[PDB]
Amino acid sequence: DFLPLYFGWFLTKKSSETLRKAGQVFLEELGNHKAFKKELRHFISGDEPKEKLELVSYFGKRPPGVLHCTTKFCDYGKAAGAEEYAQQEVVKRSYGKAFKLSISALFVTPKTAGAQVVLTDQELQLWPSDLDKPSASEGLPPGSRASVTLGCAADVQPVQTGLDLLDILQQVKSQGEAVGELPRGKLYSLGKGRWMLSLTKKMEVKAIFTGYYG
Numbered sequence: 001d002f003l004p005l006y007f008g009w010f011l012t013k014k015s016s017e018t019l020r021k022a023g024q025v026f027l028e029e030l031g032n033h034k035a036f037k038k039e040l041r042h043f044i045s046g047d048e049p050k051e052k053l054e055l056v057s058y059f060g061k062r063p064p065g066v067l068h069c070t071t072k073f074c075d076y077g078k079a080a081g082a083e084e085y086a087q088q089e090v091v092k093r094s095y096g097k098a099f100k101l102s103i104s105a106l107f108v109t110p111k112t113a114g115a116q117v118v119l120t121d122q123e124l125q126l127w128p129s130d131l132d133k134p135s136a137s138e139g140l141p142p143g144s145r146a147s148v149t150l151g152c153a154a155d156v157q158p159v160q161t162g163l164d165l166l167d168i169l170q171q172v173k174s175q176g177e178a179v180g181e182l183p184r185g186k187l188y189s190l191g192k193g194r195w196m197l198s199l200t201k202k203m204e205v206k207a208i209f210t211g212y213y214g
């Protein structure tokens with residue numbers, strides 16, 4: 001009768017830790033970077049001092065356990081489109097199956113810290129096509145929203161990560177030069193507190209497609 005809270009790909013303990021660690025390294029490096037410090041007044045909007053901001057602290061709300069990539073939030077069936085999504089053959093067939101998710105970039109905004117996921121064609125079959133889509137997904141390839149949440153600002157909800165990624169991708173839908181080089185790739189400053197690290201080598205994380213119940 002009733003559905004999960006949401007469906008998605010859940011990373012193994014190992015892959016989760018690899019990505020989490022990479023995310024944390026990025027926050028530390030990004031926060032220490034001259035280009036980021038230079039734009040602090042576009043990132044925070046209060047009476048903060050001239051001092052340095054520690055981003056690991058800023059993104060204080062982090063996933064407590066394994067990371068995941070949400071496909072469809074269902075709220076046990078209360079969410080629009082949940083039933084329709086869950087009844088798809090491909091969803092039922094893929095339930096419990098192993099997949100690999102390709103991580104192409106890490107990003108930061110004043111609201112969230114996340115990882116961009118680039119879904120395979122097979123995985124795109126599990127991406128919902130709802131009647132109620134975020135406006136921002138329009139004009140971009142299906143599944144562009146696909147992401148993993150690494151942290152959130154205090155009053156932010158994990159759903160914002162996907163939304164932030166869509167806004168970043170609309171922003172880059174030409175592309176200017178990078179403002180820095182980090183060990184894992186090039187750093188871009190997209191304005192309005194938004195930052196993207198484009199990985200030289202995509203990370204591959206193992207995960208299982210399944211349903212989460214609160």
Ligand SMILES: Nc1ncnc2c1ncn2[C@@H]1O[C@H](CO)[C@H]2O[P@](O)(=S)O[C@H]21
Pocket residue numbers: 006069070072073148149157158159160161162
């Ligand atoms: N209305 C929504 N649409 C899409 N995803 C959602 C929605 N509400 C919550 N989520 C996501 O579902 C999970 C549990 O709330 C979280 O994983 P995470 O993708 S990081 O962001 C959250």
